[PDB]
Amino acid sequence: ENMKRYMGRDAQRMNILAGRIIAETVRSTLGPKGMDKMLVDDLGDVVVTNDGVTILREMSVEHPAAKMLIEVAKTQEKEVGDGTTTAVVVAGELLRKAEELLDQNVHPTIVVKGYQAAAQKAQELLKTIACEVGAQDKEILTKIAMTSITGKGAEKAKEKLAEIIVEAVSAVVDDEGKVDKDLIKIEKKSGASIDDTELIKGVLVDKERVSAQMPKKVTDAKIALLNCAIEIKETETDAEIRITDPAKLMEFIEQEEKMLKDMVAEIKASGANVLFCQKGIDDLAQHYLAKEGIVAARRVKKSDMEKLAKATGANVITNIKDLSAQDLGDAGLVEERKISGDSMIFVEECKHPKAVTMLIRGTTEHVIEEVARAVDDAVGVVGCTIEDGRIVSGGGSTEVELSMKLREYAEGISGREQLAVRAFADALEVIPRTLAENAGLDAIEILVKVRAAHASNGNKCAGLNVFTGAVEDMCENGVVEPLRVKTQAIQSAAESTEMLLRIDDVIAAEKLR
Amino acid sequence: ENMKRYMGRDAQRMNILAGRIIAETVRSTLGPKGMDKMLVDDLGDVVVTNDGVTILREMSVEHPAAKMLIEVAKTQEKEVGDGTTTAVVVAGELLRKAEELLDQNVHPTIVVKGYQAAAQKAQELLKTIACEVGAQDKEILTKIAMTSITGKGAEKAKEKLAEIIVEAVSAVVDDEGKVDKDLIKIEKKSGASIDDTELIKGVLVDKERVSAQMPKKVTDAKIALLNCAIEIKETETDAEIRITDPAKLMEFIEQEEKMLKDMVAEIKASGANVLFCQKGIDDLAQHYLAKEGIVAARRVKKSDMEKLAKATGANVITNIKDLSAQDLGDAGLVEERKISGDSMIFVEECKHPKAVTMLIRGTTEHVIEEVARAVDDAVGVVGCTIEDGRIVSGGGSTEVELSMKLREYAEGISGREQLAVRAFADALEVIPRTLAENAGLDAIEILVKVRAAHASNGNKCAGLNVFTGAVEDMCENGVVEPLRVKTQAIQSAAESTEMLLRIDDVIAAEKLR
Amino acid sequence: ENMKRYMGRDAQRMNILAGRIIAETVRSTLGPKGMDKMLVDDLGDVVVTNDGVTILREMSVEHPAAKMLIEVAKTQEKEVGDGTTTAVVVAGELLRKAEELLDQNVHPTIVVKGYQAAAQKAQELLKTIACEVGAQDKEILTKIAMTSITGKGAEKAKEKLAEIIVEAVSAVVDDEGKVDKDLIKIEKKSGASIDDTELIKGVLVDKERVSAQMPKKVTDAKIALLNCAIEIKETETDAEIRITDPAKLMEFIEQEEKMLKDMVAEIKASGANVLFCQKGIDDLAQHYLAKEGIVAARRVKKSDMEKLAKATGANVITNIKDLSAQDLGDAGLVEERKISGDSMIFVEECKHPKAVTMLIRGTTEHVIEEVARAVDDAVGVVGCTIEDGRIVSGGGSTEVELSMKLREYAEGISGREQLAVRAFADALEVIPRTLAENAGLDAIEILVKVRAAHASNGNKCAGLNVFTGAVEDMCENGVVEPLRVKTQAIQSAAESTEMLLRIDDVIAAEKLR
Ligand SMILES: Nc1ncnc2c1ncn2[C@@H]1O[C@H](COP(=O)(O)OP(=O)(O)O)[C@@H](O)[C@H]1O
Ligand SMILES: Nc1ncnc2c1ncn2[C@@H]1O[C@H](COP(=O)(O)OP(=O)(O)O)[C@@H](O)[C@H]1O
Ligand SMILES: Nc1ncnc2c1ncn2[C@@H]1O[C@H](COP(=O)(O)OP(=O)(O)O)[C@@H](O)[C@H]1O
Ligand SMILES: [K+]
Ligand SMILES: [K+]
Ligand SMILES: [K+]
Ligand SMILES: [Mg+2]
Ligand SMILES: [Mg+2]
Ligand SMILES: [Mg+2]
């Protein structure tokens, strides 16, 4: 270009263009025929993925409005877990549709007040076009999980990953019927092939036992968890022993030895035969533990302590004098193993696991760093279905329905907000358009057939099959999504587009915060 | 912005944007409420105008596609004379409409083949919606001239400039019924006010008479024009006179004096009493001319010689021996005057003037450098009406008619060129839109009323009154234009938009030409 | 200030401010109590003056709009001669009044269309409030001349300069009743005091006679003027004399001597005794001229030849063979003198002088370079009165009348141009305001009394006396001006303000012209 062209567009055109750029970046990642992006560091680190929020999070992005569009992905990441590409593409299409009305000289506030009236209507419509399913229905959960894994390169294992994830999530559904994601532990150990991934009803700990005389395999373990260290106590008032009789050198030392001997006696009297310590164990304590045949690990991290207490039913104890048979957990099998070159301790056959571990395998680290994402997304959508019990039809069959039902809305509205309501309704069809664009299909010929299927039936479901290249019922096909993925997406995108429509100036700030 | 955004748009988006910038530059100059631009040099020269092709000609413009849009104005300048802003605004609106179809993934060749089918249809329609008027009809010529001067700051004198220009142009209509613009001489002498502009049925010459004894006023002049110089001839073979007798110094010198004396005798015997020489006159020749009472000017420029020969009916003579009463022109009054600080020779009351001079007055040089443009445009449109005898209704009442009649066309066409035909028909309404935008009117409310006036009548004429802010018959109002202004505009704009639509790459050249 | 404030004003505010600056520069030079400016070069040259157009012409001025305001002074300089400060002050007050309406969001075209309607009304009013006087009336001419000299530092001699200038101008009134300024020669010879300035009914020539034997004083001179040089003619065909007999060396040389002897014989036979040559005279020709007692000067410049021919009635001759008693001028006294250190030839007591010389004296070159300006302005206003025969009352009594009579106009006009008409009428009172501001008077208290004097009488004349500090009849006081000074001023200022009101953009140009 040239210097003398900075004059030729408003600040709103500036911002709308800076925004459209971000949506144009991620759009080709969408749908089953989507493609991956390669991210490269200054230092030479490399990432390969088609996860949208990850691309938007790792990109070098410098314009303020583009920075404002990245926050549209993160909220979908945080509150739902899947859907971080639909949100940004719809947001940018809303920006670009708004650009088509400002060049006809429509006031920005009129556009904003129209979009506002359209989004609440889309909430009503989404709340009434959905299908209602029970949370105990594991089959549709499998189908939704598979729908989450499709298009991500790790497709070849989806019909196994689905079962694994459905059980994994069904375990951690709490006594109030809610899914917490951090109660599932995801571990990434290389070697073997992606189909060697498996589910552990228990924990994998990044530790090896302290003393090698300690039995390496235990059955029907009695597991004790400690937050206190097995070491000689100090006085928080400062001390000196002052040895005036030579005969009292060995006596002082023997009494320190006995103060550890009694701790080990007490650990034994509880009934334990496996031990975890969140803190240090002395090398003489280790001796008495290996002399009593108790298996012990030390300096275990707090999150692993939480997951052990969850899995076994043990209680973390802060003082050994209170430890009793009431505080001990149970687990059918404990064994140390060597896997992928690392020594690790395995806990298996737990009495009633409230936490579970998923072990992802793979021939390469760049493979596993993607399979982990493909599993996190499925945990998301499964939790959504279990919590809300409402599902919607996939393959963009929802956006066509919404566009039609908002156009039937727009004739009731009069004035000039009607223009913005129509531009909003016409911006949601970017998704089935792009779903055909990526597969190399003819989008303009496809979209008409898709619309026609709806207009003659009230068919909630009909949409594009990107393989046969034909228009099919997406519920009979088994392409299903949870309702929370649409509402959140539209909600985020509308609320973030209105801010860029309400701005008219850009000025400089003096060390803001 | 930022470096890492160069990737995000195609070469076609590049070119379309670089083009839209130019049309956005000149658009606010359009219509009666249009505003002027100030142009500033590197050296400090200044120009103030709202003439479009002048803005586009003097601008520092560096991108190739913007350079390609400037050629849309120059052709309208060259072939018609007026209309250089409608062309560029319509061109950029065509670019921007084309941009709305490429983001739906329509092939560029499909767009080009649609535009092509639309422009020929617009030619048919323009050839059939026009009004047919005779070239002798001076009243409508006045009305068209006034329409050409409206909106240019020099509005206060338009009802005098119209009469002046109509007579000036009617003089130079040749025996084959065609108007040549260079047969009208436009002169720019400061002082007095714009209303002191006047028309001379003759010539103003940038000369003063050679010898001050020569009469300064002559009535019923007999004017002689020479291409040869009145000087002593040289031999194109080289010469020496070789004086061997002292008594032959004065004799050689006297014979050179006689060789000028006889030329002046011969000029007198033709019957002349006023002289113009395209070349030198010797200081002794000047003596004999002032002794015979013949008025003479020397080194007159060739174009002034042409205009004198045209105005008086004299014949430019290359050799004085052939000069006769057959070669002399006639003019009722010749006088030298001092005007605006310059000495000039005035020729008036010509026997049958085939050329005329217009003397533009004004209080400032920046004023006159604009009044000259405002008169050149009216000479243009008057010539167009005199040559073609076809007129069209103004105030954008033509573009609405064309848009409607192309939409009635577009339902006959099937396939995907129909989309491009509609986008073409919807791009011509940029003109009545901008005509309301500049006057501070509400364009979206105005345009509907304007359309309605047409749809119920076949009213060719109805359009915006930018003063009352209301929709009126633009023929009863007297706002008229020549047909050649529309056809050429659309023709140029379509042909120049198709080139930017057919390009897909930009590469570097090795000293092209 | 700071970088981040360039945003905060429009291009029109830019231009209006850049314009107001120029009017603020020159405003304190206005009126009898006005003060002078000092101008300093890069090289060290110095000028001291309060002439406005000179300040505006010599200033380093770089912004385009300020460059556009300088053209308001030059036209008043060129077409009238006096009034170059009223024009610019009124122009800037019009700019600043326009600024007060744009901050209420009035459209620029509305302002321009109001100013236009006001200025034509001011022309009508000025054409009807003036007083009609005959051109033979030398008394009012004296009074106007004195009014032109007041306030310029050279006040002490005004009652002599007035008589000198009135006679000087009355001489050069041509047979058609028009005054040409270049027919008066202004000469600037230092020494003595400003009161030693005098008028010559003839010419002062920057020459001394060629041969010192030539009489230095001649009475009832017979003056011959030549455009040809008194030298041996050459052949424009090239020559060689070829001397084959030694006896023919002196013969060739004697014949060249005789060819000059005969020219001098012929000059004598015409009857001449004083000679001027616009070209060379040979050193032997000088001998024969000093032998015949004829006084001769050579290489006289063309303008001096014109003024001699005008003053004496002689005819400039191009060839000596035609010179006769018909071609000789007459003058009662010719003498060479030494004055101010320069030798000069004086021509006096001319038979019927159509040209006159004014000899300005003074103790310093910076004094005379100002007295010349103070005399040029009076020649201007005297010519204006002699040509038009219409006068107006001074001391700002005209601007108050115009403001009142335009306010009585503004109630007939309806719409929003009424606002601009009022702002125009209220902008003309800047002149009587500044006339009080410079004298250190209280302008707000003065202006009301001045208005009241008009409102109760139709008194055309009442205005400020800047000495007594009181309101008086300016015709009984003898402060009179020619009508052409007001009309031109208002006309220039309105036409130049409308251009800056019609602009809305500033862009860069590519070597304009
Ligand atoms: N078999 C299929 N045919 C067509 N579309 C599908 C199919 N399976 C999934 N999809 C669609 O792919 C989209 C998911 O793409 P994805 O890359 O996950 O985007 P996001 O990250 O925003 O969820 C959903 O809109 C879904 O309807
Ligand atoms: N009284 C009027 N009301 C509305 N439009 C007018 C009027 N007079 C002229 N026009 C319009 O102004 C336009 C001319 O604008 P102009 O600045 O000359 O553009 P161009 O240089 O392209 O001809 C024409 O389209 C004409 O119809
Ligand atoms: N005795 C006086 N009292 C008040 N005003 C006067 C008097 N004599 C002249 N003037 C005013 O001085 C003004 C001339 O000022 P001047 O510096 O010549 O400005 P300009 O160069 O624009 O003519 C005139 O408006 C005239 O009316
Ligand atoms: K994907
Ligand atoms: K215009
Ligand atoms: K002064
Ligand atoms: Mg997804
Ligand atoms: Mg035009
Ligand atoms: Mg003055």
Side-chain angles (χ1 to χ4, degrees), chain C residues 29 31 50 151-152:
Chain C
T29 66
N50 65 6
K152 301 196 164 172

Side-chain angles (χ1 to χ4, degrees), chain A residues 486-498:
Chain A
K486 295 291 161 167
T487 53
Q488 188 70 48
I490 282 175
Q491 177 177 292
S492 298
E495 282 180 30
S496 60
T497 304
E498 275 150 47

Side-chain angles (χ1 to χ4, degrees), chain A residues 1-2 5 9 13-14 18 20-21 24 61-63 66 100 103-106 416 437 442 444-445, chain B residues 1-2 5 9 13-14 18 20-21 24 61-63 66 100 103-106 416 437 442 444-445:
Chain A
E1 285 80 9
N2 169 267
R5 307 196 145 191
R9 56 181 176 242
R13 286 178 164 185
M14 207 96 82
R20 288 173 60 188
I21 272 158
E24 291 279 32
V61 165
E62 295 193 20
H63 189 276
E100 289 182 4
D103 287 333
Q104 303 165 50
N105 306 290
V106 172
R416 294 195 182 164
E437 294 171 13
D442 185 0
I444 285 162
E445 168 172 359
Chain B
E1 285 80 9
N2 169 267
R5 307 196 145 191
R9 56 181 176 242
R13 286 178 164 185
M14 207 96 82
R20 288 173 60 188
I21 272 158
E24 291 279 32
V61 165
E62 295 193 20
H63 189 276
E100 289 182 4
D103 287 333
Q104 303 165 50
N105 306 291
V106 172
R416 294 195 183 164
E437 294 171 13
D442 185 0
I444 285 162
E445 168 172 359

Side-chain angles (χ1 to χ4, degrees), chain A residues 29-32 82-86 147 150 394-396 464 466-467 474 479 481:
Chain A
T29 66
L30 186 76
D82 190 350
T84 76
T85 337
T86 291
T147 299
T150 289
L464 175 56
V466 298
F467 308 107
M474 299 309 280
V479 171
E481 289 165 25

Side-chain angles (χ1 to χ4, degrees), chain C residues 18 72 89 95 116 123 126 167 173 194 199 230 233 241 248 273 370 378 384 437 509:
Chain C
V72 195
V89 176
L95 282 175
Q116 277 181 353
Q123 300 304 332
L126 276 160
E167 288 200 288
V173 174
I194 302 163
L199 178 67
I230 301 174
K233 293 163 171 179
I241 38 166
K248 292 209 165 192
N273 52 20
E370 183 75 0
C384 296
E437 294 171 13

Side-chain angles (χ1 to χ4, degrees), chain C residues 5 17 74 169 206 266 287 302 317 358 397 469 511:
Chain C
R5 307 196 144 191
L17 187 51
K74 289 174 185 168
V169 180
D206 181 17
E266 267 171 355
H287 174 72
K302 196 258 198 172
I317 298 293
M358 292 186 307
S397 57
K511 301 174 157 177

Side-chain angles (χ1 to χ4, degrees), chain A residues 100 104, chain B residues 16 20 90-104 111 115 419-420 422-428 433 497 501:
Chain A
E100 289 182 4
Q104 303 165 50
Chain B
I16 283 166
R20 288 173 60 188
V90 175
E93 187 69 3
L94 283 177
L95 282 175
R96 184 194 72 77
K97 265 312 175 159
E99 186 176 20
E100 289 182 4
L101 300 164
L102 295 164
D103 287 333
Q104 303 165 50
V111 192
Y115 281 172
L419 302 193
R422 280 173 173 169
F424 186 97
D426 292 323
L428 299 161
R433 190 201 297 164
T497 304
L501 291 194

Side-chain angles (χ1 to χ4, degrees), chain B residues 160-161 164 194-200 337 339 346 348 357-361:
Chain B
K160 179 165 171 168
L161 294 197
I164 286 175
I194 302 163
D195 292 21
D196 298 299
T197 284
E198 52 179 42
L199 178 67
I200 318 167
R337 291 180 192 122
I339 270 162
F346 276 81
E348 271 164 38
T357 290
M358 293 186 307
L359 182 53
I360 282 168
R361 311 303 312 272

